[PDB]
Design a binder for this molecule. Structure first.
Ligand SMILES: NC(=O)C1=CN([C@@H]2O[C@H](COP(=O)(O)OP(=O)(O)OC[C@H]3O[C@@H](n4cnc5c(N)ncnc54)[C@H](O)[C@@H]3O)[C@@H](O)[C@H]2O)C=CC1
Ligand SMILES: NC(=O)C1=CN([C@@H]2O[C@H](COP(=O)(O)OP(=O)(O)OC[C@H]3O[C@@H](n4cnc5c(N)ncnc54)[C@H](O)[C@@H]3O)[C@@H](O)[C@H]2O)C=CC1
Ligand SMILES: [Zn+2]
Ligand SMILES: [Zn+2]
Ligand SMILES: [Zn+2]
Ligand SMILES: [Zn+2]
Lengths: 376, 373
């Protein structure tokens, strides 16, 4: 518990694929040079974590999952001076070393720290010196996307976290760790929505809803929300959607319907679902000449685009953590919440003990929730 | 308004070559101009028309890249008179629709078919034709139909140019040069000091190299499977050249290694399934941009991971130029030697020998063959 000593605490480990999480007692070593050890206060489950338990996907085991959270600094490694015990922080999967070609360009938010560009979900699986800080029943355990928040205490790289306001409500600002930021920024930075434009958002979960918030703040005059589960519409409307459509209850392809309603198509579209049908429709429903499609979610490995479509004016791009330069922007999003610029409360549907983590996973797998807050 | 009797090339059906025939050309009506063609070239698009695998209409008068002079104008026309030099084109700018008014695109409300533009603008504004042969009415092609001594076009499809222009060279502005030059400048938006890659070294790709250089690029890589295309590439601005058939590793991997990560802008002026995939792969992460110009296949497949990691895709239409307003400017640049079009013309042949010009192109032996009368 105290500095320099190994800690023993609760956690949830995935011993192998296609299986539920087990509650165990583990040992968390102290931080080394350029590392920080955090006490996790609140955390949520994200579809990216569950995706790791899918047998048809690539992943490593045994591992400690989790990447959306908020907490407090317990101790820091040798030579560290930008962090100290007591400070409130928020870690993330997108690093910002501030010391590379990519970090210097205003055209991207990627960083030279990343190594795998074909399978990012298995990158950052160990610390810089290529060793692990986790141990359980003798065996060494893998880290997950540089965070691993499903443990009371974790250790991260200085390039993977930021200090925030001393009076921040950690049981809510934890949403800034992944979901909210990714959707909000996709609209503002990646798609670059403009005043008076028309937008279309596919998928109404935490990401899609945050994208609607972003479009409204950017000044769009019309926002069309699409989802196969109609029960998600009321919450979308409370946040800014002006129209709603269920592909399942329509006679014609949903894109043909959108095209009719707008007399040609929308200026900007964002896919926050990621299926073969949503990706195709997201492109189809934009106006020719200057229509823009931004990819956010992706459950499939590829998309097929007709050649005549780009020749006629349509373009395609995608986002990574909402396009935010992580270390510099996260503090600012926290300040915005303080000033009531947007309400993170509507994104929370459940609250439960960390012990019941497996129930939160079922709820999400059943589309009966948005986000569930877990606490130790 | 007399009817003119002249010669022209007609395609009667799919699967057979063009036939030289004697036809009748009617006088121009309101908002129309009758042009005397002085020089015309053959473009890959004209050849696709007779391929049974492609969609097309028959019988038709093909051709769409040329330069010429005004013979006569229709009732009420005042911006044109007999003797003026002009250049027609497939991308209209009617200036009486909503799209022409927008600074976000170069498309126009005059267009109707967006899945097969090669069969659009097949008749005039009033839905009738101006061509006749052996008692049969004949179709127009993409609003131009240049394979004829005389043709008639809508005022939204041409522009008057400098009185001293050399019509035997500025004809390239009608399609090929403008499309490649503009793809780099307007569509890809190449910037000073950047690195680019151009796939395909025919008229369009060479013009893209000319455009990259004028925009300020510091490095220009040229790729083609036919090595005889290299000497002209270097004469126009290429700094490095690569032939896929003489490399063991895939060409996109060679480009990535020679640049330590890839290029800032790529332009596909070939359009095969292999070039489209390579054009995307050879761009840098974070901000790499791929622009589609050529297109031999109907689709392209993009990996989800690539767009998430910063790569983007777009495409060009007549180089992004507002046709009526920009063509005259391009003619002026040539007059002032900003670039040199003479290097793009490799042969000349009498109009009656059109079929020999087509065979020359299908053997990869030429860039552009000018046809004269
Ligand atoms: N690009 C990046 O950096 C990030 C990507 N993501 C990804 O974004 C996606 C969304 O995340 P969440 O909102 O948290 O997930 P979620 O599971 O809550 O959202 C999915 C929603 O899409 C709907 N849907 C499913 N099939 C549909 C169809 N055919 N048409 C319309 N709607 C359909 C569902 O009914 C549901 O409401 C995930 O795939 C996630 O991994 C999350 C964070 C960052
Ligand atoms: N988007 C638009 O508005 C326009 C599009 N185009 C299109 O652009 C294309 C090119 O036109 P041109 O230069 O006149 O044709 P071309 O036939 O002379 O040019 C093709 C060139 O690419 C090369 N090539 C073929 N396969 C290759 C491969 N795998 N790797 C590298 N090089 C390869 C050939 O050897 C040849 O030199 C056509 O498909 C044409 O229809 C032309 C004008 C405007
Ligand atoms: Zn996530
Ligand atoms: Zn960096
Ligand atoms: Zn052409
Ligand atoms: Zn118009």
């Amino acid at each position: 518990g105290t500095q320099g000593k190994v800690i023993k605490c609760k956690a949830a480990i995935a011993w192998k694929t296609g299986s539920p999480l087990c509650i165990e007692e583990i040992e968390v070593s102290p931080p080394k040079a350029c590392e920080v050890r955090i006490q996790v206060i609140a955390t949520c489950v994200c579809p990216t974590d569950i995706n790791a338990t899918d047998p048809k996907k690539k992943a490593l085991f045994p591992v400690v999952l989790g990447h959306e959270c908020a907490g407090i600094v317990e101790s820091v490694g040798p030579g560290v001076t930008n962090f100290k015990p007591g400070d409130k922080v928020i870690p993330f999967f997108a690093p910002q070393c501030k010391r590379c070609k990519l970090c210097l360009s205003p055209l991207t938010n990627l960083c030279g720290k990343l190594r795998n560009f074909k399978y990012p979900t298995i990158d950052q699986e160990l610390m810089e010196d290529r060793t692990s800080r986790f141990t359980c029943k003798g065996r060494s355990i893998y880290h997950f996307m540089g965070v691993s928040s499903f443990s009371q205490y974790t250790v991260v790289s200085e390039a993977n976290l930021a200090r925030v306001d001393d009076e921040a409500n950690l049981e809510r600002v934890c949403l800034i760790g992944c979901g909210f930021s990714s959707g909000y920024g996709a609209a503002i930075n990646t798609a670059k929505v403009t005043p008076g434009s028309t937008c279309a958002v596919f998928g109404l979960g935490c990401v899609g809803l945050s994208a609607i918030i972003g479009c409204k703040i950017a000044g769009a005059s019309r926002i069309i929300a699409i989802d196969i589960n109609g029960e998600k519409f009321p919450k979308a409307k409370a946040l800014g959607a002006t129209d709603c459509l269920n592909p399942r209850e329509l006679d014609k392809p949903v894109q043909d319907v959108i095209t009719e309603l707008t007399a040609g198509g929308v200026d900007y579209s964002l896919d926050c679902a990621g299926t073969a049908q949503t990706l195709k429709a997201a492109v189809d429903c934009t106006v020719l000449g200057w229509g823009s499609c931004t990819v956010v979610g992706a459950k499939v490995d590829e998309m097929t685009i007709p050649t005549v479509d780009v020749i006629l004016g349509r373009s395609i791009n995608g986002t990574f953590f909402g396009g935010w330069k992580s270390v510099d922007s996260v503090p600012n999003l926290v300040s915005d919440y303080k000033n009531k610029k947007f309400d993170l409360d509507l994104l929370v549907t459940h609250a439960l003990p960390f012990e019941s983590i497996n129930d939160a996973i079922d709820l999400m797998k059943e589309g009966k929730s948005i986000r569930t807050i877990l606490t130790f």
